[PDB]
Amino acid sequence: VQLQQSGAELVRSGASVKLSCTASGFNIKDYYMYWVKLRPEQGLEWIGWIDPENGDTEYVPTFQGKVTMTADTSSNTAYLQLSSLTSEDTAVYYCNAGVITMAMDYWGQGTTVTTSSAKTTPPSVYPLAPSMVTLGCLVKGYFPEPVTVTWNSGSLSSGVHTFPAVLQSDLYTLSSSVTVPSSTWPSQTVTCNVAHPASSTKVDKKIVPR
C-alpha cells in the first residue's frame, strides 16, 4: 500500500528533470494521480492531475507549458516532467493517488528538486566528544542535500537528535546528537554513519574520547 517517488534531484537552471511516482498494492487507473508543490516555509500549490485511464491531463494555469504529466499503466508509474527549470522550482514534489468514488487515498513520500548550478561536494565528517552523556558528529560543507545520519547502523535511534541542514558558504552544514547512558560509552563503541548518495560516499566515524 505504497506510492514511492524517486530520489532527490539536483539540476541546472535551464535543464529539465523527470520525477517518477510508482504504486504498489493498487493500480493507477483507479485514481487520479495529482501533483503538489511544497516550497520550503510556504504553502502547498496544486499543479494538476493525470487520469491514467485515458491519459487526460489538467494543469493549473500557473504551470502550463512548464509541466508535463505522463503515466505508464504497464508498470503502474506516474511521471512529472518539469522543463526549463528556474530557482522558483526548488521545492518538494508529492504525487497523490486520490479519487472520490461514486474514497481512499495515497501519498508519495515526495521528491526534493534542487535548482542550482553549483557542484556535488562530499561532506567532511567531524567527531564530537565531551547518568547519561551526549555525543555527536558534524557534517560540514557538502552539496547537494540530503545526507543521512544513523547511529550504530540504526540500532541506536532513541535519543538521537538530528537537525535540518543549513546553507552557508554555498554548501550545507548539519549535525547530529545522540545521548547515551555513560556506562554504555566509551565501554561500548558509539559510531555515526553518514550517507551522501549524491557523491556516493559513506562515512563511518567512531567517537573516541579526546
Binding site: 493549473v60 501519498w107 567527531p127 551526549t134 558534524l138 541542514a165
Partner: protein, 215 residues
Amino acid sequence: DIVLTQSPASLAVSLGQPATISCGASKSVRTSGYSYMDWNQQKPGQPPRRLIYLVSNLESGVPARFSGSGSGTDFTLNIHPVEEEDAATYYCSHIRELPRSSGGGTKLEIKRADAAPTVSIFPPSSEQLTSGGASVVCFLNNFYPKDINVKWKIDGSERQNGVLNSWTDQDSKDSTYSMSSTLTLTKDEYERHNSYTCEATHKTSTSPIVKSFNR
C-alpha cells in the same frame, strides 16, 4: 481562483483539550450536488495526509476524534481530545473549482509543562583544525517551548557573525523541541582566544544556561 482563508495561523493546545481550525472560501464551495472541501495534515517531515474529504467524510485511518463541518463559505475542523501525534500543519483544500486551492496552513503545537534545554558545548575537533576551519558546536536538546535565545561569548565578549542555528520540529512523542547553534571561526582566530561560552536564555531559569570550555 478561490482564496481560502485559514484561521488561525498558529495554535498551541494541551493534550486532552479540544481544538478547532477555520476555513473561509471567497466563494461557495458547493457545486451542483455535494461540496468538495478537504482537510490535510502534514506531520513534521512527512508527506501531507488527507483527513477529511467532502466536508465531513473521515478518511480511513483517521481517529473518531476528528470531525469537520460547514457549508458554502464556512468550514471548521474539530479535534477533542488532542494528542501528541496530532502535531502538524493543517490545510483546507477546495476542489469545487479548477484551479483547486489551498489554505495557508494552521500550525498545531502541543502545549506541555515547561522544560529546560539539556545543553552541551563541543570544541572544534583536531581533524578540522588541521584543515583550516574551526567550528564550536553547542547542542540544546529537549526543551519547551520553542522560543529560546542563544548567545555566544568568546573570552567574555558577545559574538554575532559566524553563528548558524537550526531547530527540529516539535517531537511527536515527547513534545519537546531541540536546537543546534554553531560558531564557525578560522583556526587562527580560534587560537587567538581562550574561553568559549554558549548561553541559552529561555523562559525556564531567569539567567541563562551556559555551557563552556577553555582553550
